[PDB]
Amino acid sequence: QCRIQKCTTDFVSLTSHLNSAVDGFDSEFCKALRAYAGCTQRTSKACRGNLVYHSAVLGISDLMSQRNCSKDGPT
Amino acid sequence: PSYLFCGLFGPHLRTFKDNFQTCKVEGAWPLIDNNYLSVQVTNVPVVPGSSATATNKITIIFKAHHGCTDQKVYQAVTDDLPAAFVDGTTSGGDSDAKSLRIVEYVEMHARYIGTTVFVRQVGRYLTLAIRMPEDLAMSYEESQDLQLCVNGCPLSER
Amino acid sequence: PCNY
Amino acid sequence: PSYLFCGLFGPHLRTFKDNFQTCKVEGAWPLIDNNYLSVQVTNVPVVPGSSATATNKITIIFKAHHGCTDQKVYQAVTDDLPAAFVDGTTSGGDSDAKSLRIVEYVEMHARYIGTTVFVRQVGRYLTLAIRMPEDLAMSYEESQDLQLCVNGCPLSER
Amino acid sequence: PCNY
Amino acid sequence: QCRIQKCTTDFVSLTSHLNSAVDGFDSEFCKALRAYAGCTQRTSKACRGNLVYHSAVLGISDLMSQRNCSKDGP
Amino acid sequence: PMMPPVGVQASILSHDTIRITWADNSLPKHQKITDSRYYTVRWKTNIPANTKYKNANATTLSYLVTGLKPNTLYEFSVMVTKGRRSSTWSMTAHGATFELVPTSPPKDVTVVSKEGKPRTIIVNWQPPSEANGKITGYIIYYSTDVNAEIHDWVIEPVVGNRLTHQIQELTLDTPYYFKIQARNSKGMGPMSEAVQFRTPKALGS
Amino acid sequence: PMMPPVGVQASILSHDTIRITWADNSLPKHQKITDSRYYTVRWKTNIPANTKYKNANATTLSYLVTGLKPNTLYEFSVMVTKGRRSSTWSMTAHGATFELVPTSPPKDVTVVSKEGKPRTIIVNWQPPSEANGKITGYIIYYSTDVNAEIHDWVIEPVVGNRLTHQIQELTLDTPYYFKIQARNSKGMGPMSEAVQFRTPKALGS
Amino acid sequence: LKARCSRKALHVNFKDMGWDDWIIAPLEYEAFHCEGLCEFPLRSHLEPTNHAVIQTLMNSMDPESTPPTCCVPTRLSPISILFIDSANNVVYKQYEDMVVESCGCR
Amino acid sequence: KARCSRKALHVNFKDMGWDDWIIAPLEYEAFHCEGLCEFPLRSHLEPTNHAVIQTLMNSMDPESTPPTCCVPTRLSPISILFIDSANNVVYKQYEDMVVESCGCR
Ligand SMILES: *[C@@H]1O[C@H](CO)[C@@H](O)[C@H](O)[C@H]1NC(C)=O
Ligand SMILES: *[C@@H]1O[C@H](CO)[C@@H](O)[C@H](O)[C@H]1NC(C)=O
Ligand SMILES: *[C@@H]1O[C@H](CO)[C@@H](O)[C@H](O)[C@H]1NC(C)=O
């Protein structure tokens, strides 16, 4: 079924501690973002019409643009 | 301004009054027949003798609106969804006049009457979505009493 | 001007 | 810790389980009969032969709690609401021991069992409000099955 | 200490 | 009946234009608070047990203390 | 004005008697009274509600207080007077009387049929108004015979901190008679007058 | 590479014919072709969906395009070739053909009984697929006689921007026959083949 | 300046978000949003819960003991969305809680 | 910089002087909600569709709309024993007195 909540939970679990005052914030954040993008992509069909899913996809893409995360890279 | 929506799909009808109906309405039937627009559909039984029907033709008449558009007719049929009016034009009136236009769903933007018409082919049949301003959607003469989008289907067709 |  | 409340007034009963009942319960009846506390009331028909009854006596037994209080008994009757236990004391145990006290409603604060008991006279009759911790309110032996505050009144009394 |  | 909402509506109507950064906030506020206190007192009996009423009474009293609005006044 | 008396002390003698003693600082050593001064002793307890102070004049520096309630906490204070001069009431001293055997019976004896168990009765009561000490138990006596001698009645001993008791295995549609007595560290109080309760019968469906 | 042709112009001659003319800047004064160059003219319209361009080679700087649809907007562009050398397609020019009388009948003629009014019929139709111009009206012919000559049929003229019409005062439980024809500024199109509709009868309650 | 809790405009353009690849209609709608101060006393139309009544009181008496209540949607209405579903079919569905109808302090 | 959470909030009716009409309880734990509502909202914050869209828009352009707000999404009653206008002892469930869950709305 639609499993966007798992993707989001993973992303929140992985990044909740991150604080921009520490050195590797942006790299760890971009890694988590790429993983979040990948997880959401793999449940795209089941989630069609779920605003949580569509908002995740767009918000992820926008955050990756804002934080300058390469679309390809480590997770 | 507030908007009223009408839909026909695989047939099933969603009226401007948000009543959902399953209608047979075999042959040619008016969805809209008002002062600004004519929307005419042809429905065919899915198999012979079936009460379940689906859309094989959509005709839209954008009536002449002085200073905005000359009369334009759009027609789509199963396996023929053009991105132009029957005269090969993609816009109403002059080259400068963009109050009425078609873009490839194929969409018709009749800005002059705040009206949008979306047409697509889902499998062997056609679907239709209409967004129209309430005052314009309800602007019709007494004799224009058969309009599936306004009053739904006759009881005998449901 | 034509716009609704 | 969560609190359970019991009430008796003009009789009408509100149980620890929030069921509201109108009970006759004429004579002496236990409201509470548990490991820590005894609450006993006397109800009298408002007029002879009436099923409507009201409270003329409230007895509270604060059972001995080693190191906190010796056994204390409070008793109020119509036209006699003292601010002391039957032995003339206003606190349990020693002079330093304030785990059990009475203040003038007359109120009993049994801090040691997180219990409060409010008593007042409304007209010719007595009212009662009890606030007790859930685990203590439900801490009683199998034979202590008649407790108006826990199970409400017998069906025949309603 | 006596307090619940 | 409990008519606390009438008292509150009046107070809010009367103070809706007040902007804390404008020069006469406290004097108009106190007059308003005093009227709010009076209105809430006139429906007190009907409102016992009504959390909106009891909160209003206490909130008003506290504000009048915070802002040093005299008990009596215009 | 006049200095109030000091060192007020309550000596417990019995269940109804307490001796009060005090010192007067205005007085010479051995508390020798060499003038027309007299003392006033005042006392009360908190039971029943709204009692007033009892008073007594004393010619010397002691007073025996009698007719007190058993197992009761009393407050005592002293003042001195000399014609026109009068002191304030001293610091209060307290004294609790000794216990006495209960002198009144349990009250409001109520007998009911247990719900769903008609061969079981519930006996409910109120303490004696004259408990005269901590109630350590009650005794419930019951019989089917109203004229049976007391020693022939069924005995049901019970704890003193409870006011409800259940009696099982009784005969249906039968009159029973109940008497209760309280007990304390001093002994048995009087018995309540017998209460009658007829057990229910069956309602065939 | 080679310079594309310029000044592409569409001269409307009829409902199916348009003459295309263009200039070649690479050419000398008076546009005289003195080499082995040839031109390619391409054209299409947007009706029906997904049409492909039609092409034609031209020996000179003009080309007559025939067999076009009436009242249709076409696009035209020109390119030049010289053995190995070939230019890109020029800027496009447009041209709309003249109207022609409709050449096909109204379609999907559907006749229904009006709800609650069984002596009223509703005639619904679709435009001719070959309207060949702006439809200015329709004519509905009806009869109770299937063999009556056309001039004996009841005539019901109707506006061209509507596809539904109501006919009142008809006889119940009676077969009726309907034919429709479209009209434009050029005249009358053909009539649709008669459609039969038997009016309803009464259902006595 | 610091306005009190109010309903404000919020225009949602699904085409700008790229969602027109699955949404057919509408491609935009007015969602509104809530914003502004929740101050003692809460006006009746802010329709507070008992909890919000108490919290607003406590924040008024001691802004350090509790934060103020928050201006949020208290009534919302759906919009009907025509979209292409996971089976690639046209579906019309009411999306609940899409349009703010009233704001209040919670 | 804490994220939306349920936090302690102790209500003391006696400190407020309401013990002239409230009999019991004289205090209770009401809790309160506080903290950031950030994209992406975890499932347990239970956003409405509207909150989902608003959080998204505020993430993409904080000028277009403020973030959603941390507020009680589930509350529970407490039973209050009190004296009413007619000097009747009343026991009543006061609805929505205790925050059970917080979320972004
Ligand atoms: C991303 O790049 C832009 C442009 O250089 C810069 O302004 C911004 O601060 C960068 N942000 C991050 C998180 O790297
Ligand atoms: C004590 O003596 C005074 C003065 O003679 C007198 O008025 C008072 O009544 C006496 N008290 C008692 C208890 O007799
Ligand atoms: C035009 O000429 C070229 C070269 O001879 C030829 O390949 C092409 O097919 C011709 N086009 C038409 C429409 O005949």
Numbering used by the authors:
A (entry chain D): 53 to 127
B (entry chain d), D (entry chain c): 158 to 167, 169 to 262, 268 to 321
C (entry chain T), E (entry chain S): 138 to 141
F (entry chain C): 53 to 126
G (entry chain E), H (entry chain F): 884 to 1088
I (entry chain B): 396 to 501
J (entry chain A): 397 to 501
What did the study's authors say about this model?
Repulsive guidance molecules (RGMs) are cell surface proteins that control processes ranging from brain development to iron metabolism. RGMs can bind to the cell guidance receptor Neogenin (NEO1) and act as coreceptors for the bone morphogenetic proteins (BMPs). Structural analysis of RGMs and their complexes with NEO1 and BMP2 revealed a common RGM architecture comprising an N-terminal domain (RGMND) essential for BMP binding and a C-terminal domain (RGMCD) sufficient for NEO1 binding. Here, we determined high-resolution structures of all three human RGMs in complex with the BMP ligand growth differentiation factor 5 (GDF5) and the ternary complex of GDF5 with RGM and NEO1.
To test this hypothesis, we determined the structure of the ternary complex between the two membrane proximal NEO1 fibronectin-type III domains (NEO1FN56), RGMBECD and GDF5 to 5.5 Å resolution. In the complex, the GDF5 dimer binds to two RGMB ectodomains in a similar arrangement to that in the binary RGMBND–GDF5 complex. RGMBND is connected to the RGMB C-terminal domain (RGMBCD) via a flexible linker (∼12 residues), as suggested by its fragmentary electron density. RGMBCD is sandwiched between GDF5 and NEO1. A hydrophobic face of RGMBCD (Phe162–Phe166, Arg172, Tyr268–Glu270, Phe281, Ala292) interacts with a hydrophobic region of GDF5 (Ile419–Leu422, Val485–Tyr487, Leu477–Ile479). However, this interaction is likely to play a minor role in the RGMB–GDF5 interactions, as RGMBND is sufficient to bind to GDF5 with high affinity. The 2:2:2 NEO1–RGMB–GDF5 architecture is compatible with a potential arrangement of RGMs, NEO1, and GDF5 on the cell surface. C termini of RGMB and NEO1 point in the same direction and could be accommodated on the surface of one cell to control downstream signaling. In summary, our structural analysis of the ternary NEO1–RGMB–GDF5 complex combined with cellular assays reveal the modular architecture of RGMB where its N-terminal domain acts as a robust inhibitor of GDF5 signaling, whereas its C-terminal domain interacts with NEO1.
